[PDB]
Amino acid sequence: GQSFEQWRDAFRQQALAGGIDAQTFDRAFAGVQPDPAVVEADRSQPEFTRPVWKYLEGALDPLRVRQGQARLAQHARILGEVDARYAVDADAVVAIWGMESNYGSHMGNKNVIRSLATLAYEGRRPEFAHAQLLAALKILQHGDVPASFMIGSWAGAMGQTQFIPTTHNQYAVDFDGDGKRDIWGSPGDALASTANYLKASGWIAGQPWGFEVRLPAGFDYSLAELTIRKPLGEWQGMGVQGVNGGPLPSGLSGEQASLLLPAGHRGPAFLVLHNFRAILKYNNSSAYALAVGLLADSFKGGGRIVGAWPLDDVPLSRSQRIELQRQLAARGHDPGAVDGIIGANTRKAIRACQQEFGWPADGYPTPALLDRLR
C-alpha cells in the first residue's frame, strides 16, 4: 500500500487469513507508525567495518567475561538442568547469551511489531519482514509475552536470545512451568531455548568448537576455507601442530575440521570443528562464532590467543570491497557478482590474485592488495 495505513489494512487481511485473531492484530498494532531509525539501520550497508581484532576486544571485554562467570554461578541449578537435558555445554549457552544481549541487559529498545511492520512496508527485504511479522503475531496470540514487552533489535531479533520470530516459534522452550515461552523476562526459558537451538544446530557436548594451531612454514594457505573440511589427523599430517608445537588433541583424530585465518597468514590460525558450525547457524558470521568460542573458553580461564594480531590490518569498507571485486575481475580473476561481499567466490579470486603476486594465498583482502591493483 502507498500510505502505512493502506499497507496495514492490506496486511491485516493476510494476517487474518493466516490465523491471527482480529483483537491480537489490533492490540499489536495499536499505536504503531513507521520507525525511521529502523529504516536507517536497514539502509546502513556498513561501509567502515571490523577488524575481527576490534570486534573481539568488545566481545571478550573482561567486564563481559566476569559478568558471564557471575551468571554461571547465579543460574547454576538452571544451567545444570539445561546442560543435562539438552546435552549442550553451559559455557557455550552463557557465551551466546552474553554475545546476544549481554546476559539480558541489552535486549534492545524497539517494539518488534513496529520494527517488522516498518521493514515490511518500506525496507530492503520485505519478504523476510512479512514472514517474521506474521510469526510474531502468532507469538502474541499464544500469549508468550504481552505486545508492550515484545522488545528486540531493529531487525526483529527478540529478547534475551535475539531469536527472530520464526526461530522462536520453532525452538523456544518453556522451562518452568507456566505455559509461556518467555525469552524476554525468564532466564530459564531463555537459556533452555538457546540450548535447544544449539542442540538442533548439531551441538556435541564436551567437544571443542575449535582451537588455535601453529601452521608450518610455506603452508598452503589455499586450504584455509570453511567449505574445506579434513580430519584432524590429516591436518596433523600436513604439519599442523598444537599452538606451542607438538600433537593435536588425541581422540579427535577423525573429527572433520576447517582452518580459519581471521586476519590472514600473519595472524592467528584456528582449526574449527563441528560445534563452530553449530554456532554459525545461530549467527552466520565466523567473527561471531570465534568470539563465542573464545568467550566460553574464557569463563574457565582459557580463550588466550598465542599468535599476535597483525598491527597493519585495516578492514576494507563497503566501497573498497566493491572496488576490489572490480579490480579482480579486470585482471582476469573472477570474484563472481560484484556484491561488496567477500564470500567463497571472491576469496577464490583473491587467492589466484595473491599467487600471481607471489604472496601467500590466504584469500584475505588487505588494503596493501588493493594498492597493488593500481
Ligand X SMILES: CO[C@@H]1O[C@H](CO)[C@@H](O[C@@H]2O[C@H](CO)[C@@H](O)[C@H](O)[C@H]2NC(C)=O)[C@H](O[C@H](C)C(N)=O)[C@H]1NC(C)=O
Exactly one of 19, 21, 106, 357 binds ligand X (CB under 6 A); which one?
106
Torsion (CA) 97, 102, 106, 110 in degrees, nearest 10: -30
Binding-site partner at residue 167 among ligand NAG, ligand X, Ca ion, none, CB < 5 to 8 Å by type: ligand NAG
141 vs 283 by CB, closer to ligand X: 283
Residue with the shortest CB distance to ligand X:
58
| Residue, CB closest to ligand NAG | 167
Pull the grid cell for residue 317: 569498507
Q: According to the annotation, is 35 in a ligand binding site? A: no
Is 164 a known ligand-binding residue? yes
Separation of alpha carbons 221 and 41, rounded Å: 36
Task: Decide if residue 101 touches ligand X (CB under 6 A).
Answer: yes
* 152 and 107 Cβ atoms separated by less than 8 Å: yes
User: Least Å distance between CB 281 and ligand NAG?
Assistant: 6
Please report, as ranges, the residues that interact with ligand NAG according to CB under 6 A. 157, 162-164, 167, 282-283
Instruction: Name the minimum Å distance from CB 172 to Ca ion.
Output: 9
Nearer to Ca ion, 82 or 248 (CB): 82
Least distance CB 74 / ligand NAG (angstroms): 23
Q: Which of 49, 67, 69, 102 binds ligand X (CB under 6 A)?
A: 102
Which residue, among 328, 340, 335, has the nearest Cα to 45 in the 3D structure? 340
Torsion angle in degrees (nearest 10) through CA of 31, 36, 37, 39: 120
- Closest to ligand NAG by CB, 111 vs 162, is 162
SS3 257: strand
Q: Is 279 annotated as a binding residue?
A: no
**Contact between 190 and ligand X per CB under 6 A:** no
203 torsion bin: left (phi>0), alpha (psi -120 to 50), beta (else): beta
The verdict on 37 binding ligand X (CB under 6 A) reads: no
Residue in 132, 153, 258, 366 binding ligand X, rule: CB under 6 A: 153
CB–CB of 354/361 below 8 Å?
A: yes
**Which is nearer to ligand NAG, 142 or 304 (by Cβ)?**
142
In whole angstroms, what is the distance from residue 269 CA to residue 259 CA?
7
327 binds ligand X (CB under 6 A): no
User: Can residue 108 be called a binding residue for ligand X (CB under 6 A)?
Assistant: yes
Comparing CA positions, the residue from 316, 319, 371, 307 lying closest to residue 347 is 316
Within 10 A of 90 (CB to CB), how many other CB atoms are there? 23
Least spacing, CB of residue 58 vs ligand X, in Å: 3
Residue 304's SS3 state is coil
Binds 42: which of Ca ion, ligand X, ligand NAG, none (CB < 5-8 Å by kind):
none
C-alpha cell belonging to residue 128: 523476510
Give binding residues for Ca(2+) as ranges: 174, 176, 178, 180, 189
